[PDB]
Amino acid sequence: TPSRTDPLVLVFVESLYSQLGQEVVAILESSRFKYRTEIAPGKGDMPTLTDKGRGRFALIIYENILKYVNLDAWNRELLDKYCVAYGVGIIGFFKANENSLLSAQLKGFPLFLHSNLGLKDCSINPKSPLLYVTRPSEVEKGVLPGEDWTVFQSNHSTYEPVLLAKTRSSESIPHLGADAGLHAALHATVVQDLGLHDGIQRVLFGNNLNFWLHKLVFVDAVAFLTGKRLSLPLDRYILVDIDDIFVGKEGTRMKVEDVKALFDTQNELRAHIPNFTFNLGYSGKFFHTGTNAEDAGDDLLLSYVKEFWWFPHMWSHMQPHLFHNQSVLAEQMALNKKFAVEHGIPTDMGYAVAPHHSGVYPVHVQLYEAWKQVWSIRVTSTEEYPHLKPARYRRGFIHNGIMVLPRQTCGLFTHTIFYNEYPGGSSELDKIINGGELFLTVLLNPISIFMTHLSNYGNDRLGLYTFKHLVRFLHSWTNLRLQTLPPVQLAQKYFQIFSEEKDPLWQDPCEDKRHKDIWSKEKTCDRFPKLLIIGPQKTGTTALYLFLGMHPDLSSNYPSSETFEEIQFFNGHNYHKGIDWYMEFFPIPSNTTSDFYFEKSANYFDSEVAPRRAAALLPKAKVLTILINPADRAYSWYQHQRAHDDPVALKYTFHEVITAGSDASSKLRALQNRCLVPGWYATHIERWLSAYHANQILVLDGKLLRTEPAKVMDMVQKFLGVTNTIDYHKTLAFDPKKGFWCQLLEGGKTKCLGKSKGRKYPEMDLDSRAFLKDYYRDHNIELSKLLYKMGQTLPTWLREDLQNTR
Amino acid sequence: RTDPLVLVFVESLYSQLGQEVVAILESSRFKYRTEIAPGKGDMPTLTDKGRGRFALIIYENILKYVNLDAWNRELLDKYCVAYGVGIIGFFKANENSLLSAQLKGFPLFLHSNLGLKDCSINPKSPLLYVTRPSEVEKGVLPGEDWTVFQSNHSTYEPVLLAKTRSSESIPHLGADAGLHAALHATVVQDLGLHDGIQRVLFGNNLNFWLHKLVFVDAVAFLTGKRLSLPLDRYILVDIDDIFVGKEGTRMKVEDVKALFDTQNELRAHIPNFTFNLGYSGKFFHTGTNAEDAGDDLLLSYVKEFWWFPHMWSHMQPHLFHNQSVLAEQMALNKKFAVEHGIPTDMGYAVAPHHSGVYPVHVQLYEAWKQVWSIRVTSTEEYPHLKPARYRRGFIHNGIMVLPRQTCGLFTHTIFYNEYPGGSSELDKIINGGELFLTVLLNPISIFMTHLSNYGNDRLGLYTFKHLVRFLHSWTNLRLQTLPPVQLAQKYFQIFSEEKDPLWQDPCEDKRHKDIWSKEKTCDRFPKLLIIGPQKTGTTALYLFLGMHPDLSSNYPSSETFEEIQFFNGHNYHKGIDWYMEFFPIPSNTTSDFYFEKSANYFDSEVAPRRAAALLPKAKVLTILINPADRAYSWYQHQRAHDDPVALKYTFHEVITAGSDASSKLRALQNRCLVPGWYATHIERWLSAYHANQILVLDGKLLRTEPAKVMDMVQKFLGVTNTIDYHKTLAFDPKKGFWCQLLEGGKTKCLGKSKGRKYPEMDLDSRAFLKDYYRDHNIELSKLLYKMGQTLPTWLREDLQNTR
């Protein structure tokens, strides 16, 4: 049976910032394993592990292993009972403590910890079950960084050594017993607890994650203890892009000898990773820059050509975003395509690259259109977002059907030609390879597209050095099946493994200062409305939206007409078309100031998607919901559909719609769902409250909005921080025709809320009112708890209902 | 062990039974926590450090106790066994529920939806230990609903036994039951030896009045009397309106004899019964020859009977501004009292109909001390009209104010009789009603009656004679009479809280607020409190806020201190009205946005609760800087002061020093270290107020650009327009700090005390304070993030570098 505990990882950190806590989190985020961080005091209790029937975390990780061992007797017995009952394993790290004695028996453990050791010459012991998967690896010779290290000693089946190292001193650990041999034994720096007795399996790391081999063994520990409910594939896809072909300063371009060395090294790599190809990024304009030795390089590249893969930059090699006009981008692409055909450099590849490694950001719709039109490229790639790093942080997204992949750095950068400039000298190259960012990128990302340059190539041949040494190091210490995918199938595989990648969320370019600077100035995050009026619909959401709009500072957004009266941009085409199409709608905000913009969609509340999607792009935004008795709101929706005179609302009475069960036809069930689901007000507000700050969220009494709208409008202006408040008692009037309050216009004219909503209806049936009162009883009880916990006011009708039992 | 705290699982707080359960727990005044029992939901962690959160657990609905997930059920049962936490459970009759069902996990069968009659207490149970054994409660128990319990076990002992309404026994009688119906158990005790936890199960809902009585006894029994409510009850009977009333009001000869005879019968019940006679001179001798003979007999009482004045004037202090006119009316009534020879010593009076009690006028309290020297007074209205239980006496101006109780006659209405609620409503408050509950739950009861009342149905005499008889039949409490002044001293000895005056706005009473003029405004009370801690730059923020013309500062008492220190100071004790006079009175047309700044308020425990009671709306603002630089700035402030301790020792010598340090050295240590606390103090404000209510400023930013901090403050206050403080502030290099820019480019800097430039604290003291504040700065970062306020720049820097 499936583990009761979820694939979720519980990570006990000393603090988030703290170096080991951040390294643990960075591995979980890269793996895109789901996790929850808690700060674990030793004293502090463990969070309620279970959620009914299931353990929260299949796996538990203690950054500070002393926080796990030092527990109160009650919380310790509770956690141990959970670990045995659910089979949750524990990963623990030890840090040497100055205060702590060097040698100590671990709490609860027979195990002995010997701390503050220099170590050297680390080896993997095949014996321990932990990393069979990793090949027995070469001995990592030389000095392991850090005095700090802890080694583990115990004799039992319980404890199997995984990593074994020597002390720096030739002499063994001092005051060794007779039993210990003259020669020092290799000391265990990582141990696996079978944990049969405990009932839980553990993996204990002597030293910090920072030491690069601990990051490798930590990935294996998470995989083992989880039960590998989800595992990271052995399989790794590598693409190497050589940007700036026919581009660069003289000498950057490969000479005849450099082009031969590129071809020969491709053939050496291929053995490692099969069907190794090189993907050559070219700019025409730059091309034939070269002199006679560089032009002989260009000739050898084309003699290569059929083998090698090819993609365009711009002849201009300008970033496409800059070029707002799509025809100018398409013309630059068509020139580079003509050169490729003349060359014979394969059109077939149907690959293209953002020029200047840019234009991908901020996402330019004209670039995506021009790429389909001229090159038909399904796939592209970008470093840029959200930033350069985390590498892990960025994930591929799909937009307009084009699959966008995350680009990775060697650590060589365009800006700095020279390795030397790169701080930290030769040891910094070794550090990125062992436990470095480039090593971690291959360890954690199933797919890695490495950016290099031709210009880089004419040089040290640092590109050849880097990849030849990386592949050798990976083969010595880990077993990965290295593959290359043709970029289009690789992208399809990427967005199959990550669903989320498939459906991207994209930040406005503004947020990153450099993305905002590429992006046109006018577009702003601010431009999208600060405030979202989420519903539920038939709140009388259109009346609130109309009355809010009035305040001059406060400006409403221009609804998509097509989608509906309600803007419905999120659900509607507008998102799909893109954020940029919606912003274009918006006029550039006034120069003097930008207006406090707001929108109102029913759809936002109704959709699950809309709350999470809105909170990701504008977490800033104030969120506003309006709750009235859910029966009167259901009846007002039924009377709205009848006004619509849609066939279902004409056919079925409100009582026949709600009563109808599964029997009801799909249209009757859709009407039932629109009556009842939005009824759910507590369930829907809880989703918004899980995303949005309490201050961020305002829950209005919709009874009060109907009976005195001006009191509700004063609460809304305060909640928005609108610059000016409005006395809505002076600007609103009761329209007897409507039977509701409306905006007062000069001349005493009234601008009522939309007729369709709140359309005049017959009295609600008493039997339908009684039926809906009983149907909503438990929903109204949970709404009262939620609003009290918010501190938000409960609806006046809900307080009255919950005071009298009747 | 387990704390006295009670965990109460309600279906809902709101619901009627949930509120009745809570009202009994509150009247008992035992500490409790209400949770809505989730069927699904887990219980909150019961235990803390090895102690149980609640010694006792109560399930309003027993289905909330039985429905658990297997994990949370096993957790709760393990807690109950390990700590001996008892469980009280009630059944609710349910249509859905079967008429007969076995309770889950226990043998005890439930038979539901029964009429019942003729309830008795099983002889084992006292039931109330104190009380004499109760007679069979004859007649019909209300409600179909009832559940009876059946089981064979040592575990289950019957406490209450009743009969079915029908002669025939309840259908599906068990084998155990005989052909004749057994007396069926409506309340059972589970010894819970086997279970490990003792339980008490009540068949029917709390609402039925006898369940409230048995519930008080259940709490007393199961506790182990860890918490108990005193046996002892103090009763005073005030007869208002002596020699007052319309003709015919004055008592008849035979009614006055019956009053005297009944006083002598009551005395037997409780010794040294006294009646306390409230008189108006002016009205006196209204009566004709038979009423004047009543007035004569009243005065023949006089020595025996206790006496108190109602004003001859019956003026309300609101009406006359002048205190001298009130004091003269009081002096005339005092002269009449002496001529009677009515004892001075009691020195007790009450306002007629609590007239002019409120709104509190300072002149009334002054005149009362001056003319009548009354330690004690009483009022019905307060603290709140209801619940009566809610009402607690308070102390103000040294006078002890006691809660008055109704028999149910209402002064407020001209006639209670005339106005509906009827004769049956008086009988209902006496039987298990509000008047009975008032004596049951309130350790001290002052009952208001009237001489005029007597002339009447003599419903007052009926009500109290029947109430006392009913209390004596069914309960035992030790009834006592305490003279009102000693009774008040005893009251405020038993609760400190009452003694500590409760400060409330007039706002609560709409009619009292209306008496008060419009001019008094919210604005006049400082909307904004800058709580500290001090030397954050709270005085700079206060000065720059005041600077905005819309925003007006209060005027610090010269004498009191630079800071108002209202709350801390005595003046707070002096009163809210003295403070409202103090800040300028807002124009009638418009009221200014007033603010004050006291260092104390943030630091003090007292200040959070005191500010939240009076504001309560008011905005609260605190300023946090690196707590080490704030401690060093306080040390350098005391040196400037040249306080002898701060001059003698360096900051490191002050903090290292232990008990060796003298009281002055420890006071300087505390002023350096405590305010460092910022997360601990902000958590108390965050437990009371909305995020909007509270603003936490980055004090490093206020020092380095004050104008950025002033923009955040104006936004937080909701000032209509912000003002650019980058144009009105300037950095004064001499000061080393930002100051107000004046025309001419002159700077108006912070006072001498702060803003002094001194050479930085020593590296060893900085390292020591960094390590000392590490865990405080970590908790501050959590709290500010949860607030949603950003952590200070200095706090982010401090928390990133572990070293």
Residue A176 to residue B480: CA distance in whole angstroms: 82
Size (chain B), residues: 803
Q: In whole angstroms, what separates CA A331 from the centre of its chain?
A: 35
How many C-beta neighbours within 10 Å does residue A181 have? 9
Name residue B141's beta-bridge partners. Answer: B116
Decide: B5 and B53 in contact? Cβ < 8 Å. Answer: yes
Residue B220 to residue B243: CA distance in whole angstroms: 46
Q: What is the gyration radius of the CA atoms in chain B, in angstroms?
A: 33
| Token pair listed for B736 | 């080393």
> Smallest CA–CA separation between A695 and chain B, in Å?
7
Q: Do A52 and B42 touch (CB under 8 A)?
A: yes
Residue A256 to residue A298: CA distance in whole angstroms: 8
How many C-beta neighbours within 10 Å does residue B663 have? 8
Minimum-distance CB partner of A802 among B12, B40, B802: B12
For residue A692, the chain B residues in CB contact (below 8 A) are none
> Smallest CA–CA separation between B59 and chain A, in Å?
18
Q: Which of B535, B597, B619, B700 is catalytic?
A: B535
Decide: A95 and A208 in contact? Cβ < 8 Å. Answer: yes
Name residue A624's beta-bridge partners. Answer: A533, A698
- Residue B186, Cβ density class (10 Å: 0-12 exposed, 13-18 middle, ≥19 buried): buried
> Smallest CA–CA separation between B16 and chain A, in Å?
6
3-state secondary structure of A370: helix
Element housing B772 (H / E)? helix B763-787
Pairing between β-strand B184-190 and β-strand B199-202 as defined by DSSP bridges: antiparallel
Size (chain A), residues: 806
Q: How far is CA B205 from CA A745, A781, B24, B201, in A?
A: 56, 20, 14, 11
Mutation target among B71, B96, B695 for the A interface, most CBs of A within 10 A: B71
Residue B60 to residue A373: CA distance in whole angstroms: 71
Quote the CATH superfamily of domain B517-800: P-loop containing nucleotide triphosphate hydrolases (3.40.50.300)
- Residue A16, Cβ density class (10 Å: 0-12 exposed, 13-18 middle, ≥19 buried): middle
CA-closest candidate to residue A797, choices A689, A700, A659, A671: A700
Mutation target among A15, A689, A778, A786 for the B interface, most CBs of B within 10 A: A15
Q: Write down the CATH number for the domain with range A526-725+777-803.
A: 3.40.50.300
Residue A406 to residue B494: CA distance in whole angstroms: 72
| Token pair listed for A803 | 């005071």
Contacts of residue B296, defined as CB under 8 A and 6 or more positions apart, other chains included, come to: none
Mutation target among A14, A16, A17, A792 for the B interface, most CBs of B within 10 A: A17
For residue A76, the chain B residues in CB contact (below 8 A) are none
> Smallest CA–CA separation between B75 and chain A, in Å?
9
Q: Do A18 and B42 touch (CB under 8 A)?
A: no
Provide φ and ψ at A547, rounded to 5°. -70, -40
- Closest CA in chain A for residue B44: A48
Pairing between β-strand B729-732 and β-strand B737-741 as defined by DSSP bridges: antiparallel
Q: Which amino acid is at B457?
A: D
| Token pair listed for A320 | 């496409």
* Runs of H (alpha helix) within B616-705: 627-641, 644-648, 651-656, 663-673, 678-686, 699-704
3-state secondary structure of B740: strand
Contacts of residue A436, defined as CB under 8 A and 6 or more positions apart, other chains included, come to: A212, A411, A430
Residue A750 to residue A741: CA distance in whole angstroms: 9
Residue B503 among known ligand-binding residues: no
CA-closest candidate to residue A197, choices A258, A72, A275, A111: A111
Q: Concatenated DSSP letters for B162-209?
A: EEESSSSPPSS--SSS-SSPPPEEEEEEE--TTTSS-EEEESS-TTSH
Cis peptide leading into residue B383 (ω within 30°): yes
| Token pair listed for A610 | 């809309």
Element housing B706 (H / E)? helix B706-717
For residue A781, the chain B residues in CB contact (below 8 A) are 12
> Smallest CA–CA separation between B797 and chain A, in Å?
11
Decide: A642 and A671 in contact? Cβ < 8 Å. Answer: no
- Closest CA in chain B for residue A41: B775
- Closest CA in chain A for residue B689: A791
Residue B615 to residue B688: CA distance in whole angstroms: 12
Contacts of residue A746, defined as CB under 8 A and 6 or more positions apart, other chains included, come to: none
Contacts of residue B361, defined as CB under 8 A and 6 or more positions apart, other chains included, come to: B317, B318
3-state secondary structure of B58: strand
Provide φ and ψ at B233, rounded to 5°. -130, 130
Minimum-distance CB partner of A74 among B15, B50, B69: B50
Residue A456 to residue A151: CA distance in whole angstroms: 44
Q: Do B14 and A718 touch (CB under 8 A)?
A: no
- Residue B234, Cβ density class (10 Å: 0-12 exposed, 13-18 middle, ≥19 buried): buried
Scanning the structure block, which residue is given the tokens 């419009």? B518
Decide: A149 and A96 in contact? Cβ < 8 Å. Answer: yes
Minimum-distance CB partner of A695 among B42, B75, B788: B788
Residue A157 to residue A171: CA distance in whole angstroms: 28
| Start-to-end C-alpha separation, chain B | 40
> Smallest CA–CA separation between B106 and chain A, in Å?
24
Decide: A198 and A168 in contact? Cβ < 8 Å. Answer: no
Scanning the structure block, which residue is given the tokens 């009247």? B27
Q: Which amino acid is at A120?
A: K
Provide φ and ψ at B273, rounded to 5°. -75, 140
Fold of A235-502: TIM Barrel (3.20.20)
- Residue A749, Cβ density class (10 Å: 0-12 exposed, 13-18 middle, ≥19 buried): exposed
Residue B708 among known ligand-binding residues: no
Q: Which of A215, A523, A538, A622 is catalytic?
A: A538
% helix, strand, coil for chain B, step of 5: 40, 20, 40
Q: Do B15 and A805 touch (CB under 8 A)?
A: yes
For residue B50, the chain A residues in CB contact (below 8 A) are 72-74
CA-closest candidate to residue A548, choices A709, A749, A755: A709
Residue B176 to residue B338: CA distance in whole angstroms: 75
**What are the domain boundaries of chain B?**
6-223, 234-499, 517-800
For residue A53, the chain B residues in CB contact (below 8 A) are 69-71
Mutation target among A77, A695, A716 for the B interface, most CBs of B within 10 A: A695
Decide: A533 and A545 in contact? Cβ < 8 Å. Answer: yes
Interface of A with B (CB under 8 A): 15, 17-19, 45, 48, 50, 52-53, 72-74, 78, 693-696, 718, 721, 723-724, 781, 784-785, 791, 799, 802-805
CA-closest candidate to residue A611, choices A556, A721, A535, A716: A535
For residue A693, the chain B residues in CB contact (below 8 A) are 691, 788
Q: Do A804 and B16 touch (CB under 8 A)?
A: yes
DSSP B677: G
How many C-beta neighbours within 10 Å does residue B150 have? 22
If phi > 0 it is left, if psi is from -120 to 50 it is alpha, else beta; for residue A29 that is alpha
Decide: B647 and B639 in contact? Cβ < 8 Å. Answer: yes
CA-closest candidate to residue A114, choices A189, A60, A45: A189
Which positions of A make up the binding site? Answer: 538-542, 636, 741, 757-761
Residue B758 among known ligand-binding residues: yes
Q: In whole angstroms, what separates CA B585 from the centre of its chain?
A: 31
- Closest CA in chain B for residue A719: B692
Residue B405 to residue B16: CA distance in whole angstroms: 24
- Closest CA in chain A for residue B774: A15
Cis peptide leading into residue B706 (ω within 30°): no
CATH 1.20.80 applies to domain A9-226: no
Q: Do B14 and A696 touch (CB under 8 A)?
A: no
Contacts of residue A499, defined as CB under 8 A and 6 or more positions apart, other chains included, come to: none
Name residue A452's beta-bridge partners. Answer: A242
Residue A627 to residue A648: CA distance in whole angstroms: 26
Resolution in Å, one decimal, please. 4.5
- Experimental method reported for this structure: cryo-EM
Q: How far is CA A752 from CA A552, A560, A601, A640, A709, in A?
A: 18, 21, 18, 15, 12
Helix axes A630-644, A766-790, angle to 10 degrees: 120
Is B282 noted as a catalytic residue in this protein?
Answer: no
- Closest CA in chain B for residue A721: B718
The 3-state secondary structure of A553-579, one letter per residue: CEEECCCCCCCCCCCCCCCCHHHHHCH
Contacts of residue B723, defined as CB under 8 A and 6 or more positions apart, other chains included, come to: B548, B710, B714
- CATH class, B234-499 region: alpha beta
Gap sites in chain A (C to N > 2.5 Å), preceding residue numbers: none
Q: In whole angstroms, what separates CA A76 from the centre of its chain?
A: 34
For residue A47, the chain B residues in CB contact (below 8 A) are none
For residue A73, the chain B residues in CB contact (below 8 A) are 50
For residue B69, the chain A residues in CB contact (below 8 A) are 50, 52-53
Q: How far is CA B8 from CA A120, A624, B13, B36, in A?
A: 61, 34, 10, 8
Decide: A784 and B12 in contact? Cβ < 8 Å. Answer: yes
> Smallest CA–CA separation between A431 and chain B, in Å?
23
- Closest CA in chain B for residue A794: B14
**What letters, b where the CB count within 10 A reaches 16 and e where it falls short, cover A550-581?**
bbeebbbbebbeebeebbbbbbbebbeebbbe
Interface of B with A (CB under 8 A): 12, 14-17, 36, 40, 42, 45, 47, 49-50, 69-72, 75, 690-692, 715, 718, 720-721, 778, 788, 799-800, 802
Contacts of residue A768, defined as CB under 8 A and 6 or more positions apart, other chains included, come to: A631, A635, A654, A655, A658
Half-sphere CA count of A798, side-chain side, radius 13 A: 32
CATH 1.20.150.20 applies to domain B6-223: no
Residue A151 to residue A147: CA distance in whole angstroms: 12
Q: Concatenated DSSP letters for A66-83?
A: HHHHS--HHHHHHHHHHH
DSSP B524: T
Q: Which amino acid is at B251?
A: M
Domain A9-226 identical in fold to domain A526-725+777-803: yes
Provide φ and ψ at A598, rounded to 5°. -140, 155
Q: What is the gyration radius of the CA atoms in chain A, in angstroms?
A: 32
> Smallest CA–CA separation between B263 and chain A, in Å?
43
